[PDB]
């Protein structure tokens, strides 16, 4: 199994750059708006403890510098929703995508289209942590970047990128400027929580050992949902909700292994370790893959 | 983070290329069509395929090639090597600048997986030093293609044609000659012994220092001879001057010496990583260049 990215083409269409002042970043051009984190109102000084309504009070449009390479894109309005900016510009982007902005839930992977000066330089695949961090490869002038699925047409953005915590990690919004997490965009110090095993994709790696002929760890036991959970909180790993549940609902039935019983045969890996075997040729149990990722890899 | 290159250069230029009950993906570039050879090969054929002869036997309308919704007309065919060229009469106006390159092994690259002409994902990959590529490709993936972008100019390096038993891809250069002792016939083929690309284990290990991790480093030194001993001992490929000269600036940034770096390897190989991980991982990568490092750093 391979870390893979969606094809970033439709979202290296849309990205711009966005400069108040000498603050540079990024920022999304979908139809005659662009989204962009706010904190580009930010003098360096500014950020330490920033007042965004007062900053945004003197700012006009004639302020805000857009521009698709170096062709300036006029603004006409702008307006401050949550953490982000949103700049309508006088032209519609010819390469908007059918997009959606959706919001997801820690364990969701997700493609990073690391930018910049508007300037595409990388593709990757980050998780999102239970904390609500992700570990990405961002640098200065990487803010505005932003994380997306392609689902069949439709590109669901999920993440704009704005800041590092000490520890390395990162930390950012959806695109109506929501932080995932219990984070600030204000450049003072910010812990994450103690991260967690992301338990559904843990079982839909052991899903995808299976599916490839790897199966010593299935047992005859089966679980209660909420014995699991319980279980697997003193391992420091993730309960699982409803929905993760359900989106395991297609590997459960192309393996023929109910998930209760899959999460049973994790509680034994758990409670006894391997034993000195491997999986998919690995000690350790991997969870960054979520099951839509396995289904993508096996057959797509 | 394991970081590919923007794809949506490549993307413009991924058509659909069917020749009877076979389809795969092909290469779009200016008014001309790269795509894998055995595209005109029948299940008989695929054993011991005569290709100049089956070839032959084809015309320019057995090919039909599909750009989205638009079919291309195909005016003109030729085979170089294990490659087809189809001549189009349209221009794809998405061609970038480009250049055709074949790459060393150690060196990586992005790979675009298609079907049907259309772009799945993409990922970053190293030619092994045994010439094949730890890849994800399934049925229909031939034709896609791997690469590396240098300003805005794309240097196609790979088009794939086939898997191994074990599991890893062999294919050629856009030159259509295969990487390694590979034949696009339809057998079950071995590589070569791989052997880990040591440079690169050795720009990540630079790589885990630079985000703070430090824990394998040791006092010792080695010379770079004693070293190479103890590479070629387990399966790990020579050092050169010019590996070590290439990776000063990761040297210089972290302010450790390459052979004390090579110390801290041998470390890891004679004990193991003894339960720990390094940038989030219980084996020792070697899929990173020290200029991929460096860019992403
Ligand atoms: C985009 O503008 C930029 C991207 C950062 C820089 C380096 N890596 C990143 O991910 N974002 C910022 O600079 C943030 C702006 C504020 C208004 C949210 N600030 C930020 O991320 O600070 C980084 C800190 C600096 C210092 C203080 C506390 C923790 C660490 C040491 C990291
Ligand atoms: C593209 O047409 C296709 C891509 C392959 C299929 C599955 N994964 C891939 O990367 N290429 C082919 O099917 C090759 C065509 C020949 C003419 C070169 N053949 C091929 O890859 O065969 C796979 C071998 C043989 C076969 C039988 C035993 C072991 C495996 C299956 C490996
Ligand atoms: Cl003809």
């Not at 000084?45 to 900053?55: H, K, T, V």
């Not at 990073?112 to 999102?128: R, T």
Request: aromatic share 10%; hydrophobic share 35%; with cysteine.
């Amino acid at each position: 199994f391979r870390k893979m990215a969606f094809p970033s083409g439709k979202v290296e269409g849309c990205m711009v750059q966005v400069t108040c002042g000498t603050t540079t970043l990024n920022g999304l051009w979908l139809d005659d708006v662009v989204y962009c984190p706010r904190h580009v109102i930010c003098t360096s000084e500014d950020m330490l403890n920033p007042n965004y309504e007062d900053l945004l009070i003197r700012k006009s449009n004639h302020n805000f510098l857009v521009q698709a390479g170096n062709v300036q894109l006029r603004v006409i309005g702008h307006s401050m929703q949550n953490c982000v900016l949103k700049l309508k510009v006088d032209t519609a982007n010819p390469k908007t995508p059918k997009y959606k902005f959706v919001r997801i839930q820690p364990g969701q992977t997700f493609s990073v289209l690391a930018c910049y000066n508007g300037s595409p330089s990388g593709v990757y695949q980050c998780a999102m942590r239970p904390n609500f961090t992700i570990k990405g490869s961002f640098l200065n002038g990487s803010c505005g970047s932003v994380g997306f699925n392609i689902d069949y047409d439709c590109v669901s953005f999920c993440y704009m990128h704005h800041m590092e915590l000490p520890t390395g990690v990162h930390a950012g919004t959806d695109l109506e400027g929501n932080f995932y997490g219990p984070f600030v965009d204000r450049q003072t110090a910010q812990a994450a929580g103690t991260d967690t095993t992301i338990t559904v994709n843990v079982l839909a790696w052991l899903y995808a050992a299976v599916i490839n002929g790897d199966r010593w760890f299935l047992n005859r036991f089966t679980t209660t949902l909420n014995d699991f959970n319980l279980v697997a909180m003193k391992y420091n790993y993730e309960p699982l909700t409803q929905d993760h549940v359900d989106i395991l609902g297609p590997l459960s039935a192309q393996t023929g292994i109910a998930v209760l019983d899959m999460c049973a045969s994790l509680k034994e890996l758990l409670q006894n370790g391997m034993n000195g075997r491997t999986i998919l040729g690995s000690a350790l149990l991997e969870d960054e893959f979520t099951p839509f990722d396995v289904v993508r890899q096996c057959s797509g």
